[PDB]
Design a protein around this ligand. Structure first.
Ligand SMILES: CCCS(=O)(=O)Nc1cccc(Nc2ccc3ncn(C)c(=O)c3c2)c1C#N
Length: 250
């Protein structure tokens, strides 16, 4: 209630996109904000409770690599308000812009992502949907992980088979983000058949082709990727070990 933003304080601007049960807009509120409108109207109290529970989770997070929760609204509509991230998502940088990231910057982006995930796991939060589309590069330099309130290329085999969500399935998703960073591509780009990828990854016959990792990528990083991507969940390292291996790799 200390974080509820009264009706009329936020000027909603450009629509950015929709996804994750809502639509994100840029807005103004003591500067720039992002406003994620939920697809509800006259919330039933069951919905209003699920909403307050979601806000409860977000309020647990204060970390430089976690998208900054800033408030919520109930009027005129249910919405989550966060900082605005100056710049674009990691997905745009890797798969649209084709930015020439130095390998140095790639590993740093990997390091900051692991810090945020390590933090989330220390707060007992399983992300459940980590992907480069909802990792933002604020001012091109600081990772911000969003979309953990409440697709298949980041899903661990046990999640595809359908509770499979765990710290270790988060680790697998991070390994796919690593694959994006070190190849510049999404996994399974040769295949481009969603049902085939579900079938194959789910049964454990398909994993990302690590031969596409860029040649100037360090071998310790390639091995770390392979560990996060282990088909057996219990063979995946935790984020403290990932963070150690990264920060000691640089
Ligand atoms: C603190 C996480 C709250 S959330 O789980 O509800 N996720 C979000 C809540 C509000 C806005 C979100 N997205 C978001 C947030 C900030 C953003 N800043 C710049 N740009 C270009 C963006 O596309 C952008 C997108 C997100 C995300 N992800």
């Amino acid at each position: 209630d200390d974080w509820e933003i009264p009706d009329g304080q936020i000027t909603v601007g450009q629509r950015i996109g929709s996804g994750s049960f809502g639509t994100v807009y840029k807005g103004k509120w003591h500067g720039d904000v992002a406003v994620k409108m939920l697809n509800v109207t006259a919330p039933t109290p069951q919905q209003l409770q699920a909403f307050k529970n979601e806000v409860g989770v977000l309020r647990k997070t204060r970390h430089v690599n976690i998208l900054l929760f800033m408030g919520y609204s109930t009027k005129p509509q249910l919405a989550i308000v966060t900082q605005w991230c100056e710049g674009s998502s990691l997905y745009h940088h890797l798969h649209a812009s084709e930015t020439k990231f130095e390998m140095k910057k790639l590993i740093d982006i990997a390091r900051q992502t692991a810090r945020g995930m390590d933090y989330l796991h220390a707060k007992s939060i399983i992300h459940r949907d980590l992907k480069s589309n909802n990792i933002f590069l604020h001012e091109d330099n600081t990772v911000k992980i969003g979309d953990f309130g409440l697709s298949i290329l980041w899903m661990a085999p046990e999640v595809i088979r359908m509770n499979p969500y765990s710290f270790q399935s988060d680790v697998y998703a991070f390994g796919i983000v690593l694959y994006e960073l070190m190849t510049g591509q999404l996994p399974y780009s040769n295949i481009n058949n969603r049902d085939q990828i579900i079938e194959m990854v789910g049964r454990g016959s398909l994993s990302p082709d690590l031969s596409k990792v860029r040649s100037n990528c360090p071998k310790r990083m390639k091995r770390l990727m392979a560990e996060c991507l282990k088909k057996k969940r219990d063979e995946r390292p935790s984020f403290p070990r990932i963070l150690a291996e990264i920060e000691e790799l640089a």
